C-alpha cells in the first residue's frame, strides 16, 4: 500500500533523533580514557621443575609403596647393567 504521511513524518523525526544520538555515541574528544596513575621459560621449566624434582626424591620415596615401574624388558643377547652376567642366546633358526 505505502506509508501514511503521518508515519513518514513521525519516522523522519525519529531519523533526526536516532542520527543525533548515534553521532553522540561516537566519543572523540581526542582522548577517550585517562590514566589515574628468557624469563618465562627460565622460571616455568626450572622452578616448578626444581620443586617437583625435590618432591619426587624425598617425600615420594619415604612413602614406601609409591611410583613403581613396569620392568625394563631384558633380551636374550644382553647382560645385566647392575651386577653383570649374560642371558643365554637363542638356539638354531633354520628354514626361513
Amino acid at each position: 500500500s505505502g506509508y501514511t504521511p503521518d508515519e513518514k513524518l513521525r519516522l523522519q523525526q525519529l531519523r533526526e533523533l536516532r542520527r543525533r544520538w548515534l553521532k553522540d555515541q561516537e566519543l572523540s574528544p581526542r582522548e577517550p580514557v585517562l590514566p589515574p596513575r628468557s624469563i618465562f621459560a627460565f622460571t616455568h621449566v626450572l622452578i616448578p621443575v626444581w620443586i617437583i624434582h625435590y618432591y619426587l626424591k624425598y617425600h615420594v620415596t619415604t612413602k614406601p609403596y609409591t611410583i613403581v615401574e613396569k620392568k625394563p624388558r631384558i633380551f636374550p643377547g644382553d647382560t645385566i647393567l647392575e651386577t653383570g652376567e649374560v642371558i643365554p642366546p637363542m638356539k638354531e633358526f633354520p628354514d626361513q
Partner: peptide, 24 residues
Amino acid sequence: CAFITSMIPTMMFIHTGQEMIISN
C-alpha cells in the same frame, strides 16, 4: 612450554620403555 616438556619423556618411552605409575 608444556609441549616442549611433553615431547621429551615420550621419546624416552619409545627409546626404552620404563613404563611407570605415580601415586600420592
